């Protein structure tokens, strides 16, 4: 619901939603939006839909379908280099979706915008070092850039405090034409736990596990740390509930 509420941020200003210990329904979110492009790295998309892992990390931003290739760790495109990076070590699933007309409460930004270049001038006048975004981190040059880039060509500069480093930080702003239907890119970086699986798919429990399915039948019961062989018969409640 927080992802649905409000307006999705730009790729550089992407907000982070983290779910550690809750039942998850990725399929329901996939049903709500129309996903034009689905891809995953280090795991199957079907496996990601139905598996238990220690934690789930979801990043939501407005990304157009046309520049999806640029935002890849393998790609040398500037947007991936200076805006959003996804950790290679954790399995990463990348989903691009277009909001349906029926879906409501999704505010649309005036245009999609990205940081064309992020660089820091060195203390030496003739020396400049480019700054490359580390995994996530919301981008190094995000502070100079406004939430939506004002013009297709923009120049941003700010000066770091000396000692350190007393070096100007320079950023570029670029924009792309807004699509009639808003397009949003989602980056997911779930972390698997060898001994811990706090977040599990909805609904993990099944009818066979439920006593009502096996009522009247000799069955093995493993409920709340008690293991035994017994037959369950429906009867009037007795004892402390």
């Amino acid at each position, epitope marked *: 619901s927080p992802l649905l509420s409000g307006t999705p941020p730009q790729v550089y200003n992407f907000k982070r939603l983290v779910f550690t210990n809750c039942n998850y329904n990725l399929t329901k979110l996939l049903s709500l939006f129309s996903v034009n492009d689905f891809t995953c790295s280090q795991i199957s998309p079907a496996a990601i839909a139905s598996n238990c892992y220690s934690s789930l990390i979801l990043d939501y931003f407005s990304y157009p379908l046309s520049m999806k290739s640029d935002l890849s760790v393998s790609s040398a495109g500037p947007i991936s280099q200076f805006n959003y990076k996804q950790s290679f070590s954790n399995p990463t699933c990348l989903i691009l979706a277009t909001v349906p007309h029926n879906l409501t409460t999704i505010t649309k930004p005036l245009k999609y915008s990205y940081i064309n*270049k992020c660089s820091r*001038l060195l203390s030496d*006048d003739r020396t400049e070092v480019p700054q490359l975004v580390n995994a996530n981190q919301y981008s190094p040059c995000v502070s100079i850039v406004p939430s939506t880039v*004002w013009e297709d*060509g*923009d*120049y941003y*500069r700010k000066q770091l405090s000396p000692l350190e480093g007393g070096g100007w930080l*320079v950023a*570029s702003g670029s924009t792309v034409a807004m699509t009639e239907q808003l397009q949003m890119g989602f980056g997911i970086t779930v972390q698997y736990g060898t001994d811990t699986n706090s977040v599990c798919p909805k609904l993990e429990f099944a009818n066979d596990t439920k006593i009502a399915s096996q009522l009247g039948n000799c069955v093995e019961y493993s409920l709340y740390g008690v293991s035994g062989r017994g037959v369950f018969q429906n009867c009037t409640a007795v004892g402390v509930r």
Partner: antibody, heavy 120, light 109 residues
């Protein structure tokens, strides 16, 4: 403070490729944008193009877009504009002005200027 | 691109008399996004006020920027022969930024 200087005035035939050169003094380029301004005689100044050498980005006015190629290099320390296919009416004095940034489009210093006349 | 009205231009002004220049904008522009440029005859324009709020470094305090949104007025506390020049108001709120038509100032001692 960097003093701003411009190439000597030149005369070219209409449609010829003409380059106006503005050089940052000291052999090094500060982290500032470079703007090109065309002023027609007895007329208000008109912005032609904006190039930042450190950024490497190039921008041009809608009136004169794609007829001018602008290249600025920090290592060269010189920002130059190349204009090709310009009409005879286009002749005007050209000025290069320092830019604080997109948020600060005011020019603290202006180049001496180059007068280019296009006539056959 | 915003079309901007300008003061008529050449005026006869005695020294020590305040001078006001009008820079109305047909299209709405940012409340403080206007640059004043003064060019001496055969000289490059030099910024006097940035944002029509504060004088640029090395510019006399007598020149002042007043007005917001549509009409911008440049008022000079004292007038000198050196003060006489052509003044342009540039609105950088909308790109491409549009320079003022300009107003020649004449001082006859």
């Amino acid at each position: 403070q960097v003093q701003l200087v411009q190439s000597g005035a030149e005369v070219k035939k209409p449609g010829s490729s003409v380059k106006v050169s503005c050089k940052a003094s000291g052999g090094t380029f500060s982290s500032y944008g470079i703007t090109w301004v065309r002023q027609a005689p007895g007329q208000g100044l008109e912005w032609m193009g904006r190039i930042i050498p450190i950024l490497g980005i190039s921008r041009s006015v809608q009136k004169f877009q794609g007829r001018i190629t602008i290249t600025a290099d920090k290592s060269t320390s010189t920002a130059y504009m190349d204009l090709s296919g310009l009409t005879s009416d286009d002749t005007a004095v050209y000025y290069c002005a320092r830019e604080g940034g997109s948020g600060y489009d005011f020019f603290d210093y202006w180049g001496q200027g180059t007068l280019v006349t296009v006539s056959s | 691109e915003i079309v901007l009205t300008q003061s008529p231009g050449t005026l006869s002004l005695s020294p020590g008399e305040r001078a006001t220049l009008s820079c109305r904008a047909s299209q709405s522009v940012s409340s403080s996004y206007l640059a004043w440029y003064q060019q001496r005859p055969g000289q490059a324009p030099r910024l006097l006020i940035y944002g029509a709020s504060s004088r640029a470094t090395g510019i006399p305090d007598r020149f002042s920027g007043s007005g917001s949104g549509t009409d911008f007025t440049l008022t000079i506390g004292r007038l000198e022969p050196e003060d006489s020049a052509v003044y342009y108001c540039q609105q950088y709120g909308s790109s491409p930024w549009t320079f003022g038509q300009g107003t020649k100032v004449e001082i006859k001692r």
